[PDB]
Amino acid sequence: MNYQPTPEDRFTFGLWTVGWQGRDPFGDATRRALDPVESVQRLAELGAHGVTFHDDDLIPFGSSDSEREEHVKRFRQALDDTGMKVPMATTNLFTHPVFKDGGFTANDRDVRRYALRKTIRNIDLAVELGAETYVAWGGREGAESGGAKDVRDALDRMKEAFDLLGEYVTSQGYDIRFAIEPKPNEPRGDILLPTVGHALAFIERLERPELYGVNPEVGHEQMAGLNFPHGIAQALWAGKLFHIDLNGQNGIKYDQDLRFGAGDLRAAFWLVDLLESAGYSGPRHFDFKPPRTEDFDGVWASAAGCMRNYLILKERAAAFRADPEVQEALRASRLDELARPTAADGLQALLDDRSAFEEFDVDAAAARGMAFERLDQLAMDHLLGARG
Amino acid sequence: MNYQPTPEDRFTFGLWTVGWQGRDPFGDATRRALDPVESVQRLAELGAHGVTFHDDDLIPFGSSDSEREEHVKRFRQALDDTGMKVPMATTNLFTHPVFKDGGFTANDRDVRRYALRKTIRNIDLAVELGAETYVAWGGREGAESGGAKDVRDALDRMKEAFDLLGEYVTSQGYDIRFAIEPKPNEPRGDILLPTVGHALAFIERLERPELYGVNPEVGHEQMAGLNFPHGIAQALWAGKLFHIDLNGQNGIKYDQDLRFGAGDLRAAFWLVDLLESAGYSGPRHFDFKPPRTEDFDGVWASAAGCMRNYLILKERAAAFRADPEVQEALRASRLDELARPTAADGLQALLDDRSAFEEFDVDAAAARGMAFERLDQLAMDHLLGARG
Amino acid sequence: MNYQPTPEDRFTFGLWTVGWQGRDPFGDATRRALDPVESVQRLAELGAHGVTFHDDDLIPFGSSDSEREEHVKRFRQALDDTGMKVPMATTNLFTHPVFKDGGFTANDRDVRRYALRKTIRNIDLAVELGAETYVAWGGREGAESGGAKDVRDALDRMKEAFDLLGEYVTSQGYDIRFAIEPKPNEPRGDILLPTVGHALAFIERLERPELYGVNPEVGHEQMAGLNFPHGIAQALWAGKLFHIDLNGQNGIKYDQDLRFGAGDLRAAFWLVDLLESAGYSGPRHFDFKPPRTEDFDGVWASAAGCMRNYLILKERAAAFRADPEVQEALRASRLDELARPTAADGLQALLDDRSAFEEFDVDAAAARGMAFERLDQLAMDHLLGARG
Amino acid sequence: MNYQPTPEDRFTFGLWTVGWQGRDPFGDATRRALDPVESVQRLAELGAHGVTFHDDDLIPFGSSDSEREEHVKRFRQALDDTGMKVPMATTNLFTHPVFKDGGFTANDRDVRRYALRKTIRNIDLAVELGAETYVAWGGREGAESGGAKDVRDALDRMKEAFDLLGEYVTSQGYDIRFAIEPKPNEPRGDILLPTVGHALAFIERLERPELYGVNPEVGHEQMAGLNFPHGIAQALWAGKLFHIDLNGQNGIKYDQDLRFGAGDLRAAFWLVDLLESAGYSGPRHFDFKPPRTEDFDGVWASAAGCMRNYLILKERAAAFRADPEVQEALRASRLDELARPTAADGLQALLDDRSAFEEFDVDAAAARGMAFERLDQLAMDHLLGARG
Ligand SMILES: OC[C@H]1O[C@H](O)[C@H](O)[C@@H](O)[C@@H]1O
Ligand SMILES: OC[C@H]1O[C@H](O)[C@H](O)[C@@H](O)[C@@H]1O
Ligand SMILES: OC[C@H]1O[C@H](O)[C@H](O)[C@@H](O)[C@@H]1O
Ligand SMILES: OC[C@H]1O[C@H](O)[C@H](O)[C@@H](O)[C@@H]1O
Ligand SMILES: [Mn+2]
Ligand SMILES: [Mn+2]
């Protein structure tokens, strides 16, 4: 009873994840820097499907065009050698001091122009390497104080940036879509578009909404105390789940980025249940940090437990949905009735229906139990492999 | 130096606010029930502009059509006697046991039909009394466990309900718009459409989006640790701030509904600054609970401090924006540059602009301070009336 | 592979738990009131060991001494008929309006005297029924605003109340100990002694500290975002874990009181691991609310899943600690070294030890990985019954 | 109406505060390193009383004994030149990789011995420079996973470390006391002794409790959603407020360390009210980070606003307590009765007092309002300088 990943499971990892040297706000690095080509090789051996990158993970900031080409060639050789793909890429608009007040919504106009040029350069590279999704995380877009940022003007600037990027892609004829990744705070006191809902809403105001979706992250919605499976369900309902970041988080605090399955384990179960039953077919991407307590052996153990926990939860969610006793419980709780239209008969028929109001027996309806606790204990028993 | 409300300030109160008897999850009522006509008279004397109501606040659940007409006539006489208006109304789809699994997204279809009929009956009354906004708070729409609610099916049911309501209003030719009020949790373990962003996003999928906006509440966004002024700015940017609920909240915990100005006082300052500078012209509605420690004298004192604190903050925000020294600080922090287009010259010009990349001096730009702390201390000094 | 409780597992339930009628801040009761004798009989059939009570759960507030004796006689007959015990009792100092500003720390002196008399009356009854622990939950002790409560004076009043109760018990020669139950907020805006640490600290200032310990609750420490197993470890270290309340909670929000095992499932695992390895021998008490969605069938299903989840977690924690591979991992992570004294050789020897400073190789020590992620994945695999 | 600090106000600053270069988990430094002698001179000009330091702030890690003496001599000259004092010192047991699993509670014994030697070396220096308080912040003492740390063994190790430090000080005859600074999380997933209450409780188990108190920090208790003034009141009640860290925090999230007065402004008001009315006489120490958006002008502006906001709040709290109308309101709310003993007449008299139970009119007592909202609005009006 083991749980071995293959490239067909579509598991991906950012370079910055296994590559995190362990520098935190209070401490120095505990691990040496990893060569991207070493991470590609090590992740391939563990059964991953591919890797993702920020521009600056792959090509050191300020590299000359000759060093750039060299970094890319070595990387490309490692992909060729391993069969690893690059399904997603993104921009670092957060590390360099120039970005201390944001990239696309910096108060300084010149910075905002530079942010766009830096992004466009990396869209070209991403396309070259075969990425289908381009992620935007505006971790520096926000404020620590109320007068520093007019948020209406800042959303104008953010719309302008994303519209220019959509013009660029369509003008180049690229097959690439954008995914906005929300986070509510950290490193800014408050970040703009802080949740999946705020990002979904914003997208509907862009000039070409069909080019944009979301890249939600488990731990970021949980930093606002929100139900991650519920947020993903809304993104799926809107047709905007382009990509996803998988990890774990213990409640409302700094962004922990624990390996997937740590943190809120029942939420991880209901997330896998949803992705698998909705048939999500994008990458299963891990955005996690091996704790700085670990050496490189602990790094690869942590990355392997990401994949393992996904597969165990997949098996338990599938057993849950396949169990006849669960299917009967779902009927008992009227999940079947939730899926039926309230009033396919139309408004006028509803208005004329005395059984909907005038003659509706509200006490009899009130008295019916929902049988949710029995259903939830079956879900617990399935998760724990304790079906008796 | 006093701060007296008049009806022209557009201050409104729910019947359920000053009428809260003080029943909490752990204790009995501490105050007797108020007659709606007494609350109308007492609020008029304090300088309020109008009141709002749930159906069941005004007409006892299960009232006959004769008792109904009587309740409404007495109410209407009190409005006539005082000049009070009714700008907003809403439905109770949360108290009665029949609603224990939701109204519009209850698993039982019959309940969902009943929820719609109950709502439509009250839209007619609201129109009769002159309301312009109809609020929907789905406090029972959600779940305590993951298998109880398929959230894609539940959003289908929620869309269906709101589309039927928009069909009704347009068929009747009513001048009334809908406002969805988000809350992240309580009384359900997780509530659907938990934040302003999730509600804005959902609205874009309705058949007639122009009929729907949001009614955000200070304390509800703060129950997710979010920046309320930032959420309001996004609602204003989308053109969807139809109504607002004003109160206070101390951080992430149960819904406190303190009087406005209690809770996060700096957030209240930045909220008033925004509403006044954006020229919001709807009601300034208070959804608050006088603490159950209070007798009726404490009730009216609490309601009066709601209005007082709004007026004091209005004065301090106006003094802030009018101060030449603040105007200079805003320029120093490049708020003027945030309001200018990043690239009105267009994409091609941006791509050809060497000063945006090839020759952009990133260290010089990085070195410029934002001068945000000096700006924020001027804002503090203005709030505290300590300008030296 | 089933998990059947017997009275020997020491599982107990408050009357108020299965008896909760489902009244919440926003809704009416969904269930009829249960007779205490029915709950005793139903819990006995499920395998419970005993029940606990507030005074007012058992004897209706304001009962005459004749009704009192009658309520107690019927109760006592049900205990005799079932073999159920009563290991713990407590006082309701929170429901009645008189307690709206607290019991022991109400500003009104007369209320504080009444709170003490009401408590003492119930200590006598508790002793009569064989309780060994008397719990105090000061849910009304606190404030919504800063000037309402001088907290130094309020701690004086709280000390005075607990000292008088300790004088009473010792004067009567009773064998009963007190346990303070912390909660950080709700129903008061902030509650005094909000966490296990604050209660432990307070106890050290009482006249007879040996009479007092803590009754921590899973969901209450999690309402402050704290690690419940860590808080219990500190209570065990102090010798003050007199009693415990078991339930589940999804993060920082209102007090959910979900059945045990819901909420934070990994925390529940580490809690059971600790209680079992420290050999806690008190009651395993459930303070939970069957969700108001449920009818009485759902009530008893929820109570049975409390016990079931405890037993499953007990089995998985025991398998974890017994696994040789885990024992090797614990050594790899130097848990054995944590249990050894840092400096049993004494201060002077430490000062003279050059290998502790002058010649300590800090880079070699820094380079050693802690191997925590491999250990934590073994714990995950054990929890999920996925050991491969 | 200005608010100028002098050395007599006892305002102090850590070297690491104005010296923070702005490195965060996601970005590089935005400011150059400050010489400690420059910070001493600049803080003296702003009206500060003194500075505090970690060992490694003052003497670069790994410095030779000759460089050490040089660093100290230059520092000492700057103190002499300015009249600045050093009232507090502390140890860095968090930055160096060797401390990745803790200092005093690292699993590796050798690390724990090294942590103690490093600490003792700095106690000698602190004494030399005149510090009266030695702070311990165990930011690396904790865990990200449940099996990594046995918390009973870890509290044994923590007790052992603090007892050895108390033996050292008493053996040397030093006049220095210890203050433990709690924090609930960050950089560890959970930190041991996470709140003021947990630290107070732990202290009572040390061999010489009179040597130890707490150094609470505004933003750290707020990272658990707790009421900071209430926690300080308990520390004052226990006689353990040895030192305090002043700053601001917006709710439950990463540790922001905003300047004092930012964050929760009403909490800052009630804190100053308490410190001033209890007559706290230790340093008013600021542990804050000027946001990384700022240049050095913004650094000194931020440090000056710390002091300014303290003085403005001091004035408003003093005006509040001195107002006759407030004094009358406090009586109306029975704050005077809270300060009187509940039962100075003793237990037996209480038991015999029929007016305390048998003849206590609970409805009349319940009906009395507490008049807390009127009191709290007077406090608001005083804070805002809006007394009408
Ligand atoms: O978008 C790219 C990634 O950028 C940064 O590494 C963020 O911390 C991570 O959350 C995000 O996914
Ligand atoms: O929508 C109507 C109102 O309904 C209920 O009273 C809710 O608690 C309140 O938040 C909401 O504003
Ligand atoms: O102390 C007795 C019990 O009293 C109340 O029911 C509280 O809600 C519960 O937390 C507590 O355990
Ligand atoms: O104890 C010394 C100081 O050490 C570190 O700088 C901590 O971040 C700060 O909170 C603490 O006060
Ligand atoms: Mn993250
Ligand atoms: Mn991410």
Ligand SMILES: [Mn+2]
């Ligand atoms: Mn509310």
Ligand SMILES: [Mn+2]
């Ligand atoms: Mn509301």
Ligand SMILES: [Mn+2]
């Ligand atoms: Mn509880």
Ligand SMILES: [Mn+2]
């Ligand atoms: Mn409890």
Ligand SMILES: [Mn+2]
């Ligand atoms: Mn801090």
Ligand SMILES: [Mn+2]
């Ligand atoms: Mn500090």
